Write a protein that binds this ligand. Structure first.
Ligand SMILES: Nc1ncnc2c1ncn2[C@@H]1O[C@H](COP(=O)(O)OP(=O)(O)O)[C@@H](O)[C@H]1O
Ligand SMILES: Nc1ncnc2c1ncn2[C@@H]1O[C@H](COP(=O)(O)OP(=O)(O)O)[C@@H](O)[C@H]1O
Ligand SMILES: Nc1ncnc2c1ncn2[C@@H]1O[C@H](COP(=O)(O)OP(=O)(O)O)[C@@H](O)[C@H]1O
Ligand SMILES: [Mg+2]
Ligand SMILES: [Mg+2]
Ligand SMILES: [Mg+2]
Ligand SMILES: [Mg+2]
Ligand SMILES: [Mg+2]
Lengths: 525, 538, 211, 106, 526, 49
């Protein structure tokens, strides 16, 4: 080899070797990820080098946690990572479609056909498939029922049936809570908090905030009914001069005076807070809660507790925005001009203690624009799985809200797209019809994998579904319980239109790029 | 033709140290075998007749205990399915405080019976569905099996009788005495307010006189010594200071600037006079005992000794908070004299020696106080640790009783009744899930079987007798361990009762762990690493 | 991991789809190497032994013997081709190609969840039908000199160069017709093959006697 | 017992169960009691123990002798612990407690 | 003891003679063969494994060559000339490598034939001069104002890459960026696409959504939630100095002896921050962008005046913002003027893309800087798209600076070869043979195009050479897809004159440099 | 993403010490180069000079 001649320690695969290596890697990844697809898939267990246990069914998590050192595997992993980052779902389908596209392309390339014609057919079929997807999408007003259906179609695939049923209500309610009309949805306003004390079915939605820290002064109230929330970003602890001052005295009395005088700056802000609290509420019925992004020294904590004020220190940075949106106050970076109009309101604040960690609940807000999801489970791996599932559900519901259309699921859209591609194939000029046929066969992988996971046979189920679609013209998918064709739209099996479009685009692009690779080189040493 | 190459695809793409297990035989059966092995390892310590286990951890620290949670914690468990079982047991311990061995036994029995069902031809989904249905049926049944309630928690003898069953499994020989001790300690705490705090019970371990010499003290005991000459106070007026017992200094930087001879002459005299004035001002309020969380200055100690003030230094902040709770004082941030509301009162504070240990005792005379301390005696550190574990179990049982007063019969009676009723329900269920329901019912047999095996009698005769007695219409009959021949007796009369909430949580957690283990079909383990622990675990 | 490795830790085992994938890969590799051999338009392969001997050949069986391969399925295919060469003396490359293509086509449907057994009944039924058709299509002729020359051409032209094959056709046909007895089996041991290294390749001929 | 590629406990874990381990524990207790056996009574004799640094300790006290012994046997450590307990609570009888316990076990 | 004595140090190898020349020419030929297949519209992809773990899928010759490591110094020289060609004109990186390899290969013959390398070098230089003359002769003019012709030029430049199917969008993006980056100050024309034409890649979405913005985009968010994320017509103020209290560079120490001095110092710090914020507010801006940190108190004071602020921005991004929105970066807010206030950005939006916040200063009127928002399947695809866009922008800049074009698809090579051969007939010296050798070696480009297209090289090349011997056939090349001879006046594949001139010059001088080499010495240290 | 595996098929079944040169560039050109090298070594001894 020329590269080996120039660099003796070089690994090179040329011509058919490159295609063989890439297709073998893609088919291996596809074989691993076949069992993930569908709610009837099998959970995979992941043990890290430190012994950490990870139960998951997501394609992206499995891809990241497989011990693989292959270039094509890295490429497919990057594609799936982009898929998950933008749309939040479809990674397993992405990998399956890439692998089946490469396999179908090889099926023709091994017979002497050049990959360029295959790529041209793939691209023409992709254009026609996008046209058909535009023609087939269902533009609907996203009410609560449709969002529940979408969240079900995601969570049931990701977790247990009853857990999915609970998480559907949780996710849909949270999205409806944080969403404003004709405004982009900010998923940063839903805080996903984990607790490890009860069962998985106890996961619920708190229309407020839950903080992973509590009051550090033992004498502060553990439960305040009517509270004025003062979110702030002001340091309430002792601060050192920036210019390296130090003190100089000549007697013990002077030292005492200097000690009493150096706390005046912080005590002024503490006094401002105390005076605001006194002015706002002149009785003991109402309460005052101070949430500070910076630390509070014990002296200020004692001074606040002597006035019946609950103070929380070292809050999260995003908690400022979350509290201002939920409670309704104004985040303050200084106390130069503090007025009652900048105080938030909470209908109930209380602290819950779990082992060595303490939590604070802020609920009963008048109209919380930011809410929190409390994940409860007996195990850490259960918490991680539920967090992944709720992330997928939130992404699916947000996509459904953004794109007013929705695509029928259960592989019905794939079957219809394959049928349309086969019908359109004669219009393609040249030998790119082979590439179009390969693209259609690759698109047909989703019903095949669904039937295989559900336990039925690929050929009989696929021919039954295709015959039903041809005879009726409806969008018939796969019934995972019986294997018969079924109208996915009627039963509520929905898929995200953006997810399908991204799948088509990314899969076609990466397959075309891989098919044109004729040499893998490693000569950087 | 002398080597088998790796199959193309994932087999070759796998890393050099990684392992991949998939399918029934390679993954599910192996996990079930490992879980059964762990359950069999822990089984021998179940019940009052369970034997203690000598456990040596990686740090060569002795552990004698029949507590399942401690044994699991001090075993380097490597199989991850066993890890799930262990963490389910730990969750049961955290939520309730007892029943961990029940969790392991039930999970192991469920997994072996699931393996049998898979072998005979059932699918994993059918087994999981049957187990879930049977668990729901058992949870529905359990409230109907409640025999009696606590009906009183301020009483001493009744609470001791209730906790006797809880602490009879650990330290079977002498449980009446420990029951009385824990009952007194828990009744002193738990005031009219319904909340009960486990942390308010303190255990002090001083060896020398055997566990029969243990007692309960309405106060706190610190293994320290007084820093002053005064070592006994009869009308203590403790003033608690979080700051060190010394003149406070600037937090920026302290530099004594001297410009004249007079200042150099007078600086030390003024500092000493200020210290004397502060100490005398503290003493003038009547505070004859001073407790500080920091170091004690020499001049401050001298002036405290001059005014007859008892000095105790507590380095731990948790101990300072607990002392403040017990006495009723407030940890002052500065050295200012305390006002009457912040001045704590204790009926007797003195320095005493127990065995060969010098201790400081803050003793109340009333049968009240926020915190009560149990002083444990003994001849071995390991035995005293075991007694401490038994006391912890008793306190957790009392906390559960405060949470829920319902009780169920022990000694296998509840498990036998549950098995009988679940079998009866499953016999009326058409479909393939009847086998799974029947196996879930049969899994309850492992508790009385383990009890009979530990007691030294034949398990089959005991189980047959239990079925006969439950069939004839007696739901409160369990295994009688006080006999050389397999025999049964009513357990409501014997007072051998288990908390309903504990059984409910144990059943739920064991079923959840078994289902979670069964759901796993493929295992991908990375190459093991000998790293210096995760950063979170330090 | 498997049952075998439990008893023998140092055991190599491939199970279920792994064994099928290994067999298909080996067969496809052999077919890929031997594709270029088929037909008179094939390419020479130079085979250098460990001692450094040079062997230029196009025969499938000879090429398989000089492969540096340590695969079980390759060994099975080599044994089958060796039997083919021993009994009939031709068709080794076609043997390997047909076996590889059969395995590839079978895997094409097996990957779709189909059991290999059904493919085996399909294969045996198709083999029976193909044998019947081959019996139908054969051309029975009187083996005169022209037909023998044509067969020798169809073999040697694939084996060697054009004019060399033309010479070898006459040589082989004349030798066979010389030693052939009427309605008797042909004893090929009676045609001694002697080689000398002093003339060109086209100087080879037939001697109506012995050397 | 099978290799079982994935193992339950950490590799190298040693486990002893049944009557034989209890008998071995009793024998270890007797071995410990023998090391201070001759130091009891007016006719008792002292024992000399040399540490790694070369320091020599001569003592007739049972608790001191047991402390200087570097016992690692889990069951044997109980005798040393009870000797320490007797020394702490009483100060005398440290030789008697070990002998009594070992004789009970025997 | 008694160590060996010798003149040079150990491990100091030395090779001399014709073996050195053969090795150098063989190394150049190997370098050419490495990327021979990556030329033309039908070129295939190549996968490169980065030593740090990355993967590069590229068709660019320069990237492939620079991603590999070689030991032979001649290969190092080849990599260097490829990098030089990439840096100078932007494209033609593999064509120059192929040409240099072919020229050295044909010089090897005369080296074998006892001809001294100096004669070969002189003939090469004469050939280079005559090729320069012919290329300037066969050039055609181009009008800048014709946007369609510029788009066609960029298309013909990018037909060989992987962006050929989105060619229309890619050409529009490149043309808009190059035109809008174009700037002139103090009578000095400037097209600096390296600094003021930024390509930002965010994986995901579709490549059809990629576009060039009339502004800049940075991966930054507001410092405080109460701060507007959408301003209609913002007045931008740019800063490169921190808005926080910091120590001076002189060793300054305070000595506090009075009670009220500590609080006085702290209040003085607060008042200094307030003074800076008031100085900023005096110009009444809407957004404030700083390269250094902004204190929380400064954030509060800015929000009191309803002013958006971005905390920490890179130097290059701040320069791009200044060019786009017409602002001028200042350091001391007390020196701020009305002219320094940046007006011209028609909208400021901070939207969320995926799970990351992005700040847009788009909708500018007459901006001098841009960001190219790229969306695609993955990171490697976006990197290749960025490389193709870089090639397109370089070609557009070259055409803008030099409005001359020459025919592509091997037509220029064949025409110059024919002219060189015709001129060689007059010479009578020994130099004519290397002259004609260079002439025919220049024909490697159409031969490589035919080889990559899969068509038959010998008959197609013979027919093309016969066609180029006619009167007016200088624009007759070869289709890179159908493998047929076509006039480039119809196909339209034209390429800038500057690229061809640079390619020929670099190839000829690389051949000259490698021909002079003899007596290779290696092993010594520094 | 740091190693290039051997192509499935003949490349994996090759022996540890064996070599396989196939195609025009990998085989024919190398053979021609070797023959040219041998001719170069022997060339200088040709003729009376
Ligand atoms: N209840 C159902 N019945 C039939 N088909 C379903 C059902 N739920 C989901 N599906 C189909 O199974 C697929 C599940 O894909 P999924 O496992 O979510 O892959 P990814 O996580 O990569 O999106 C969807 O494409 C959907 O069409
Ligand atoms: N005196 C007794 N007679 C018979 N059974 C008993 C007696 N005391 C306790 N048990 C049984 O022993 C079990 C307690 O086992 P234990 O060792 O405490 O395990 P765990 O600590 O996990 O609960 C209870 O289920 C109870 O039925
Ligand atoms: N459609 C086409 N038909 C024929 N030749 C083409 C076509 N497009 C480009 N070429 C030729 O291909 C060359 C560009 O190939 P490219 O891969 O860009 O090499 P380089 O990177 O050296 O520019 C140009 O010299 C041009 O003459
Ligand atoms: Mg999904
Ligand atoms: Mg218990
Ligand atoms: Mg033949
Ligand atoms: Mg004595
Ligand atoms: Mg180019």
């Amino acid at each position: 080899a020329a590269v080996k001649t120039l660099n003796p320690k070089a690994e090179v695969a040329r011509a058919q070797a490159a295609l063989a290596v890439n297709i073998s890697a893609a088919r291996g990844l596809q074989d691993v990820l076949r069992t993930n697809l569908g709610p009837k898939g099998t959970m995979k267990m992941l043990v890290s080098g430190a012994g950490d246990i990870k139960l998951t069914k997501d394609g992206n998590v499995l891809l990241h946690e497989m011990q693989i050192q292959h270039p094509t595997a890295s490429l497919i992993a990057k594609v799936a990572t982009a898929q998950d980052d933008i749309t939040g779902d479809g990674t397993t389908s992405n990998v399956l479609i890439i692998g089946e596209l490469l396999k179908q392309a090889d099926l023709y390339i091994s017979e002497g056909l050049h990959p360029r014609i295959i790529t041209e057919g793939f691209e023409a079929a992709k254009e026609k498939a996008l046209q058909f997807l535009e023609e087939v999408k269902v533009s609907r007003e996203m009410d609560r029922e449709t969002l529940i259906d979408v969240a079900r179609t995601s969570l049931r695939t990701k977790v247990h049936a009853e857990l999915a049923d609970v998480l559907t209500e949780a996710v849909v309610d949270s999205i409806l809570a944080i969403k404003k009309q004709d405004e982009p949805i900010d998923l940063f306003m839903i805080e996903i908090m984990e607790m490890k004390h009860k069962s998985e079915t106890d996961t619920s939605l708190i229309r407020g905030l839950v903080l992973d820290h509590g009051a550090r002064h033992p004498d502060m109230k553990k439960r305040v009914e009517d509270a004025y929330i003062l979110t702030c970003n002001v340091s309430l602890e002792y601060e050192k001069t920036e210019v390296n001052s130090g003190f100089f005295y000549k007697s013990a009395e002077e030292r005492e005076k200097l000690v009493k005088a150096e706390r005046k700056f912080i005590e002024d802000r503490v006094k401002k807070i105390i005076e605001l609290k006194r002015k706002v509420c002149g009785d003991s019925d109402k309460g005052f809660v101070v949430i500070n992004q910076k630390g509070i020294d014990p002296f200020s904590l004692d001074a606040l507790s002597k006035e019946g004020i609950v103070a929380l220190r070292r809050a999260k940075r995003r908690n400022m925005e979350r509290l201002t949106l939920a409670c309704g106050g104004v985040a303050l970076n200084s106390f130069d001009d503090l007025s009652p109009d900048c105080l938030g309101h909470a209908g109930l604040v209380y602290e819950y203690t779990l082992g060595e960690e303490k939590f604070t609940f802020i609920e009963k807000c008048n109209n919380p624009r930011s809410v929190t999801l409390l994940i409860k489970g007996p195990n850490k791996h259960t918490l991680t799985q539920i967090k992944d599932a709720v992330r997928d559900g939130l992404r699916a519901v947000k996509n459904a809200i953004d794109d007013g259309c929705v695509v029928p699921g259960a592989g019905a859209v794939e079957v219809a797209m394959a049928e349309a591609l086969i019908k359109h194939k004669p219009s393609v000029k040249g030998r790119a019809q082979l590439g179009v046929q390969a693209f259609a066969d690759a698109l047909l992988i989703i019903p095949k994998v669904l039937a295989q996971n559900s336990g039925f046979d690929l050929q009989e189920t696929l021919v039954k579904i295709q015959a039903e679609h041809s005879e009726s013209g409806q969008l018939v998918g796969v019934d995972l319980n019986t294997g018969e064709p079924m109208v996915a739209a009627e039963v509520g099996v929905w898929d995200n239109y953006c997810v399908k479009k991204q799948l088509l685009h990314s899969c076609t692009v990466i397959a075309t790029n891989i098919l044109l690779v004729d040499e893998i080189m490693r000569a950087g040493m | 033709a002398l080597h088998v190459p790796k199959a193309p695809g994932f087999a070759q793409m796998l890393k050099e140290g990684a392992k991949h297990f998939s399918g029934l035989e390679e993954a599910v059966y192996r996990n079930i075998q490992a879980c059964k092995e762990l359950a069999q390892t822990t089984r021998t310590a179940y019940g009052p007749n369970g034997m203690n286990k000598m456990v040596i951890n990686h740090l060569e620290k002795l552990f004698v205990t029949n507590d399942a949670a401690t044994i699991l914690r001090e075993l380097e468990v490597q199989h991850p399915a066993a890890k799930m079982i262990v963490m389910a047991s730990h969750m049961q311990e955290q939520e309730v405080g007892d029943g961990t061995n029940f969790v392991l036994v039930f999970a192991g029995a469920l997994l072996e019976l699931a393996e049998e069902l898979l072998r005979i031809g059932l699918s994993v989904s059918e087994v999981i569905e049957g187990y879930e249905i049977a668990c729901r049926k058992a949870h529905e049944i359990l409230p109907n099996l409640v025999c009696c309630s606590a009906k009183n928690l301020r009483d001493i003898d009744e609470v001791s009788s209730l906790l006797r069953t809880s602490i009879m499994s650990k330290q079977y020989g002498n449980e009446v005495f420990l029951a009385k001790l824990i009952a007194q300690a828990c009744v002193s705490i738990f005031p009219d307010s319904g909340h009960f705090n486990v942390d308010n019970i303190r255990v002090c371990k001083i060896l020398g006189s055997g566990i029969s010499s243990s007692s309960v003290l309405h106060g706190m005991v610190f293994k320290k010594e007084t820093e002053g000459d005064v070592t006994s106070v009869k009308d203590a007026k403790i003033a608690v200071y979080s700051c060190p017992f010394d003149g406070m200094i600037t937090e920026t930087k302290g530099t004594v600037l001297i410009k004249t001879a007079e200042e150099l002459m007078n600086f030390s005299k003024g500092e000493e006079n200020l210290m004397d004035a502060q100490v005398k001002a503290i003493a003038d309020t009547g505070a004859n005992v001073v407790v500080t969380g920091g170091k004690v200055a020499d001049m401050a100690l001298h002036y405290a000794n001059k005014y007859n003030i008892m000095l105790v230094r507590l380095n731990s902040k948790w101990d300072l908070r607990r002392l403040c709770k017990t006495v009723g004082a407030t940890a002052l941030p500065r050295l200012t004299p305390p006002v009457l509301e912040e001045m704590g009162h204790c009926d007797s504070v003195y320095l005493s020696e127990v065995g060969d240990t010098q201790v400081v005792v803050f003793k109340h005379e009333k049968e009240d106080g926020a915190i009560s301390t149990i002083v444990l005696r003994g001849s071995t550190d390991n035995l005293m640790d075991d007694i401490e574990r038994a006391v912890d179990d008793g306190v957790n049982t009392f906390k559960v009783l405060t949470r829920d007063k319902r009780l169920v019969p022990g000694g296998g009676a509840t498990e036998i009744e549950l098995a009988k009723q679940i079998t009866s329900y499953g016999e009326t269920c058409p479909g393939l899930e009847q086998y799974a329901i029947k196996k879930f019912a049969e899994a309850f047999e492992a508790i009385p079987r383990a009890l009979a095996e530990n007691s030294g009698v034949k398990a089959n005769e005991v189980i047959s007798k239990l079925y006969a007695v439950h069939q004839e219409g007696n739901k409160n009959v369990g295994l009688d361990i006080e006999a050389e021949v397999p025999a049964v007796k009513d357990m409501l009369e014997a007072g051998i009762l288990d908390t309903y909430l504990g059984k409910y949580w144990a059943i739920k957690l064991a079923t959840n762990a078994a289902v979670t283990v069964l759901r796993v079909d493929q295992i991908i383990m990375a190459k093991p690493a000998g790293g210096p622990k995760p950063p979170s675990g330090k | 991991m498997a049952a075998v490795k439990t008893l023998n830790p140092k055991a190599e085992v491939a199970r279920a789809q792994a064994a099928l994938a290994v067999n298909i890969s080996a067969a496809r590799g052999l077919q890929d190497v031997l594709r270029t051999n088929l037909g008179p338009k094939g390419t020479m392969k130079m085979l250098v032994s460990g001692a450094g001997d040079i062997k230029l050949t196009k025969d499938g069986n000879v090429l398989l013997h000089e492969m540096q391969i340590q695969h079980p399925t390759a060994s099975l295919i080599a044994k089958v081709a060796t039997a083919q060469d021993d009994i009939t003396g031709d068709g080794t490359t076609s043997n390997v190609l047909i076996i590889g293509e059969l395995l590839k086509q079978a895997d094409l449907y097996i990957s779709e969840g189909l059991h290999p057994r059904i493919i085996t009944e399909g294969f045996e039924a198709a083999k029976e039908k193909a044998l019947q058709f081959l019996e139908e299509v054969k051309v029975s002729r009187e083996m005169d000199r022209e037909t023998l020359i044509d067969v020798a051409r169809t073999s040697l032209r694939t084996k060697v160069h054009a004019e060399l094959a033309d010479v070898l056709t006459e040589a082989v046909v004349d030798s066979i017709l010389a030693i052939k007895k009427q309605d008797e089996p042909i004893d090929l041991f009676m045609i001694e093959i002697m080689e000398m290294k002093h003339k060109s390749e086209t100087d080879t001929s037939l001697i109506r006697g012995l050397v | 017992m099978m290799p079982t590629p994935v193992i339950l406990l950490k590799e190298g874990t040693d486990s002893s169960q049944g009557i034989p381990q209890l008998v071995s524990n009793i024998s270890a207790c007797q071995v410990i009691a023998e090391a201070v056996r001759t130091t009891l009574g007016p006719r008792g004799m002292d024992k000399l123990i040399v540490d790694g640094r070369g320091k020599a300790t001569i003592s007739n006290d049972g608790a001191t002798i047991l402390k200087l012994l570097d016992v690692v046997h889990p069951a044997a450590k109980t005798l040393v612990d009870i000797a320490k307990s007797q020394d702490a609570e009483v100060g005398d009888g440290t030789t008697s407690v070990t002998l009594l316990a070992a004789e009970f076990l025997k | 003891g008694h160590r060996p004595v010798l003149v040079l140090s150990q491990n100091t190898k030395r090779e001399s003679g014709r073996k050195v020349q053969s090795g150098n020419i063989n190394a150049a030929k190997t370098i050419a063969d490495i990327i021979r297949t990556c030329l033309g519209p039908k070129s295939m992809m190549k996968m490169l494994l980065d030593p740090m773990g990355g993967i590069v899928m590229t068709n660019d010759g320069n990237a492939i060559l620079r991603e590999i490591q070689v030991q032979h110094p001649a290969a190092k020289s080849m990599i260097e000339i490829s990098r030089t060609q990439d840096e100078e004109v932007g494209d033609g990186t593999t064509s120059v490598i192929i040409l240099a390899g072919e020229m050295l290969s044909v010089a090897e013959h005369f080296l074998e034939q006892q001809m001294h390398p100096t004669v070969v070098i002189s003939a090469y230089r004469k050939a280079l001069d005559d090729m320069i003359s012919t290329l300037k002769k066969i050039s055609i003019p181009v009008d800048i104002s014709d946007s369609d012709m510029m788009l066609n030029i960029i298309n013909s430049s990018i037909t060989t890459k992987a962006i050929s199917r989105w060619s229309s969008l890619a050409c529009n993006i490149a043309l808009d960026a190059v035109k809008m980056v174009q700037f002139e100050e103090n009578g000095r024309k400037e097209i600096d696409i390296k600094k003021y034409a930024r390509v930002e890649k965010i994986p995901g979405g579709i490549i059809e959504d990629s576009c060039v913005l009339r502004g800049v985009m940075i991966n930054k968010d507001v410092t405080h939630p109460r701060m507007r994320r959408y301003i209609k017509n913002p007045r931008i103020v740019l800063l490169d100095s921190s808005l926080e209290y910091k120590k001076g560079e002189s060793q300054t120490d305070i000595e506090i002896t009075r009670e009220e001095d500590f609080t006085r110092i702290l209040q003085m710090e607060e008042e200094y921050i307030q003074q800076l914020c008031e100085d900023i507010i005096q110009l009444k801006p809407d957004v404030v962008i700083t390269e250094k940190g902004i204190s929380d108190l400064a954030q509060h004071y800015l929000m009191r005046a309803n002013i958006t602020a971005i905390r920490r921005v890179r130097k290059t991004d701040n320069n791009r913002i200044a060019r786009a929105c017409g602002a001028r970066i200042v350091s001391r807010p007390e020196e701020l003027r009305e002219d320094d206030v940046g007006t011209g950005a028609g909208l400021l939006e901070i939207k969320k893309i995926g799970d990351e916040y992005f700040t847009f200063i788009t909708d500018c009127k007459d901006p001098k800087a841009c960001t190219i928002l790229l969306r695609g399947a993955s990171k490697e695809i976006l990197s290749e798209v960025e490389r193709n866009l870089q090639d397109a922008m370089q070609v557009c800049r070259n055409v803008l600076l030099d409005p001359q074009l020459v025919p592509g698809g091997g037509a220029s090579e064949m025409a110059v070869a024919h002219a060189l051969t015709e001129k060689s007939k007059a010479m009578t010296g020994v130099e004519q043979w290397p002259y004609r050798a260079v002439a025919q070696a220049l024909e490697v480009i159409p031969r490589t195009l035919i080889q990559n297209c899969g068509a038959s090289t010998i008959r197609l090349l013979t027919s093309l050479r016969a066609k180029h011997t006619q009167e007016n056939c200088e624009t007759w090349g070869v289709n890179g897809e159908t493998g047929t001879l076509v006039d480039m006046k119809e196909l339209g594949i034209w390429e800038p004159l500057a690229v061809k001139l640079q390619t020929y010059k670099t190839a000829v001088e690389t051949a000259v440099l490698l021909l002079r080499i003899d007596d290779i010495v290696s092993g010594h240290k520094k």
